[PDB]
Design a protein around this ligand. Sequence first.
Ligand code: HEC
Ligand code: HEC
Ligand SMILES: [Mg+2]
Ligand SMILES: [Mg+2]
Lengths: 226, 227
Amino acid sequence: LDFSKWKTRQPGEFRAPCPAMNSLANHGFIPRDGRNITVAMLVPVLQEVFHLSPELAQTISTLGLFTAQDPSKGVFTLDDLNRHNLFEHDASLSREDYYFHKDASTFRPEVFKKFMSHFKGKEYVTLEDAASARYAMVQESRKKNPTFTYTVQQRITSYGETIKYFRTIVEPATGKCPVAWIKILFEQERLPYNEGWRPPKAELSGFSMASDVLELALVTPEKLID
Amino acid sequence: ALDFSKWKTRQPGEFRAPCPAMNSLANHGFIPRDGRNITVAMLVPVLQEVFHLSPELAQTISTLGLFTAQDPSKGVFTLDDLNRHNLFEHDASLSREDYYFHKDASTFRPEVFKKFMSHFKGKEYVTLEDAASARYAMVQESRKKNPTFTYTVQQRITSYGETIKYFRTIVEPATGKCPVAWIKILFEQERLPYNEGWRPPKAELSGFSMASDVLELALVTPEKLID
Ligand code: HEC
Ligand code: HEC
Ligand SMILES: [Mg+2]
Ligand SMILES: [Mg+2]
């Protein structure tokens, strides 16, 4: 894992709405041009760079394959991940809903500003602030987007994405998530190795995700009952 | 591959847990009948085969079971180890009373289970919403009556997870729906209702799918740690 090979995205290179996957490509940990991705190649990378458990890595990578133009052929691209309402969903943290400009892939400073304002004056992301920030995007989409789609599938991916950054973009010494490293991940699509980040000591598993998603929901004022 | 007709209820000397599924496995002889000499390596394929747990989820829960032994290094645990309060066993159970009251959070309590089952009165099937209400009712009873109520991050995920476990594994092959009558058999007899039509579930219960299910259960539970 040579983190010094990093280059920002170049013309012709496919990129996704994911800052993690986009960082892998920019680091050259997966093909830089965002093409020719297989589950077999991605899974070890996710385990080594982000310390996802084997099964969680296999699961998310396969959900990625399911966005391919032909998932039978076992190959997908970062552009496949941009397909609306397959994996990509409304109420994102740093991207606008597909509805508005038919581009839910391009990083949006004005969306990211809203998200980050939930951590203003803090060096670290707390569970409660991360809950508030994600749910604020749900409320905005619900009030602004007449096509808002937020089913069982989108709910877990949305909750899971907040857990993913909260658990993986952490200080080795503390396990805590610095606001400044989130900023680097989303804005630069660089893993903040230079700033002191390393692959997490703790494994992110399906079970640990389940606990974390529960804890997020218990500090979110979101209910489907009344 | 598996013989479900070998079921016997608990016999003298045999250890049993506060878990109706682990007790059914033993009563069926799918793990050692006496509730002893359980290892992770033995239990994971049984959980995969009988309950369609994912390899990783099965490994994780089996290991949580193992860390209930006084010495996990021995690599072996028993259903009696599972009876140890606030290791895996926890307050606000659906069919057992809190350890506080009589130092017995292992023996099935008709009175507790009566209150659990009251949330499905008039219904053939368990819905996510009624399962959520039945579990939260136990949390509120424990918070109301037990001065030593313990409900930390660890108990919460296991409590939510156990409702999802019966809701997803004790289901009709035809519909994936959870029959009230089958929950009654599992809890009251500690028998998998094979005789009545139950079969290992078609759908796999994985860490990811559990995470979705626990999320959805929480979204229909009036439970928050914020107000
Ligand atoms: C392994 C570590 C990992 C981390 C950390 C991670 N992801 Fe993503 N991720 C996506 C997609 C697609 C989205 C877009 C969802 C959306 O619309 O917000 C996304 C979104 C996100 C978001 C939210 C972005 C936003 O603007 O809301 C975060 C944070 C994130 N991913 C972090 C496909 C993937 C895939 C697919 C193969 C993998 C593997 C994956 N992601 C792995 C990871
Ligand atoms: C694989 C299928 C499986 C199912 C279905 C299952 N369990 Fe349990 N389970 C427990 C323990 C300990 C409890 C007691 C928790 C409590 O205090 O309610 C429990 C409780 C439960 C409960 C709630 C009972 C109540 O009175 O609240 C249900 C339902 C349950 N288990 C179902 C250890 C285990 C272990 C340990 C190795 C395994 C594996 C396990 N359980 C696997 C399973
Ligand atoms: Mg989106
Ligand atoms: Mg208990």
